């Protein structure tokens, strides 16, 4: 086997490169940097920037050895931004920052009520609710809109439905942020969270704790927003045993399985790792479906016969949209919520004949996977039908794998999916022009520029 010391790639000038990290952009273009590095050092490429080290690959083959390598308590990355707050307020960390024991201990039990078949059945009434009330805000604005049309950035209003769903099962109560006027306790909130996203993105590289030393506003704002969502667990909390003298907290709390202190943490970071994600997925989604009508109407066409053969049956219908769950799978593809899986290698392992020693940095690149041409014939074009009647595991990575794979995996399905099934059912999303979309890179795969639907009733 080839030695460690022979991998390709520029970890030999880590410190330059972090100069021209820094020098210009370089923070927005991580997932066009990672492309550029395998169609230039190939398959597998060994990286240093810094302190910050790594071993890439690209090939679904090499993401078999690495995930069978991760041992019994996989560790990915670390988010720094949001371990220095729990540090600071003396917070325990959740099933997301644990690692070890801990995250296992924990992780089994938050299965039982987050990612199992029996409670996914649970959360389909209260997603669709949320669903259907998500229709009823888009037939408003046509309605004034006049013509039957609504050409809009639905970013902030997918983000709202993101939200309001993921606290619906989370804490088992109705935000109510798709209202036209929502109360200000949810517009608070709302605010926070996304004050909390927009301070995270900073402090990824700059150490929190240097801008804490500096008292700057950035560290200020992400403890401020941070607070804000850890009062409103406490008063869910608080409404819950008063109720005793229903949502995933709700059923916590009564099991009595993980302290109170443990069943608050993994609650808030369950939240803030599905806000974000679903809504971006949904609005490239949308996107794709306005720049492909032809898979639109094949999905709608899907949908309706489902709607008709399950008898009003949610559960029925949900398991009669093959091709909706393969263009979920497709959008992932092509904008991954992550750019990377990390799991720091505990085992010497050897990827396209190269020793990788253990305790190694390994990601795996879903960004280029997904526009490679190799792995995905006609990568640039949105066709779910790649993913039907083909067979494919480390090839839809969007979700993770393994054991420590993304919990609501189940929670985001389902909500995109009724999502999608009432939308597709009440509207046409039409792109307001052709012009291309450029993606950036900020904690997620976001457009450069805000990207405007049109929404016609049908
Ligand atoms: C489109 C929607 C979503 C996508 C694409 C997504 C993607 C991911 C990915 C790639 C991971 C890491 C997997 C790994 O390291 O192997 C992850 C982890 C996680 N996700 Fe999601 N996610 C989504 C929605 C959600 C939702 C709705 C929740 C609700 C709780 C959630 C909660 C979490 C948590 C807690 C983790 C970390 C769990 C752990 O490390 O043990 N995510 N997600
Ligand atoms: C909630 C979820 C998305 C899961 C895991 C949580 C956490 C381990 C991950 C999620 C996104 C990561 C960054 C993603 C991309 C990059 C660029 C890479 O080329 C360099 C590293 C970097 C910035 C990652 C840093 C840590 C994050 C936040």
Not at 5 to 19: H, T
Not at 165 to 176: A, D, I, K, Q, T
Not at 269 to 284: F, I, K, P, R
Not at 416 to 422: D, E
Request: hydrophobic share 40%; net charge positive; aromatic share 10%.
């Amino acid at each position: 086997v080839r030695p460690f010391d022979e991998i390709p790639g520029n970890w030999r000038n880590g410190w330059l490169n972090l100069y021209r990290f820094w020098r210009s952009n370089g923070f927005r273009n991580l997932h066009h940097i990672m492309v550029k590095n395998f169609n230039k050092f190939g398959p597998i490429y060994r990286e240093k920037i810094g302190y910050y080290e790594s071993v890439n690959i690209i090939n679904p083959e090499d993401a078999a050895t690495l995930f069978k390598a991760e041992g019994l308590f996989p560790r990915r990355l670390r988010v720094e931004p949001w371990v220095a707050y729990r540090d600071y307020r003396n917070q325990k960390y959740g099933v997301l920052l644990k690692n070890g024991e801990d995250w296992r201990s924990n992780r089994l039990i938050l299965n039982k009520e987050v990612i199992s078949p029996n409670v996914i059945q649970k959360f389909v009434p209260l997603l669709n609710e949320v669903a259907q009330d998500f229709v009823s805000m888009v037939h408003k604005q046509i309605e004034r809109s006049g013509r039957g049309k609504w050409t809009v950035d639905l970013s902030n209003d997918l983000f709202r439905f993101a939200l309001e769903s993921v606290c619906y099962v989370l804490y088992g109560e109705r935000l109510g942020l798709l209202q036209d006027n929502p109360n200000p306790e949810s517009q608070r909130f709302i605010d926070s969270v996304t004050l909390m996203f927009k301070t995270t993105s900073p402090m990824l590289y700059i150490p929190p704790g240097l801008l804490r030393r500096i008292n700057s506003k950035i560290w200020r704002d992400h403890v401020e927003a941070w607070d804000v969502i850890f009062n409103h667990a406490d008063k869910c909390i608080q409404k819950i045993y008063r109720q005793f003298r229903p949502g995933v907290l709700a059923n916590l709390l009564l099991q009595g399985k993980l302290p109170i202190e443990d069943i608050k943490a993994s609650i808030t970071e369950l939240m803030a790792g599905g806000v974000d994600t679903t809504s971006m997925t949904l609005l490239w989604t949308l996107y794709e479906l306005a720049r492909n009508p032809h898979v639109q109407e094949e999905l709608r066409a899907e949908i309706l016969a489902a709607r008709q053969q399950a008898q009003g049956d949610l559960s029925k219908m949900l398991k009669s949209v093959p091709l909706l769950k393969a263009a979920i799978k497709e959008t992932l593809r092509l904008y991954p919520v992550a750019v990377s899986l990390q799991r720091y290698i505990t085992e010497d392992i050897v990827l396209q004949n190269y020793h990788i020693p253990a305790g190694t940095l390994v990601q795996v690149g879903l960004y280029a996977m997904g526009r490679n041409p190799e792995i995905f014939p006609n990568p640039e074009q949105y066709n779910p039908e790649r993913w039907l009647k083909r067979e494919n595991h480390f090839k839809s990575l969007g979700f993770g794998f393994g054991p420590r794979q993304c919990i609501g995996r189940r929670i985001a399905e389902t909500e995109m999916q009724l999502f999608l099934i009432h939308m597709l059912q009440n509207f046409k999303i039409e792109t307001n022009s052709m012009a291309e979309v450029k993606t950036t890179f900020d904690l997620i795969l976001v457009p450069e520029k805000p990207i405007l639907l049109t929404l016609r009733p049908i």
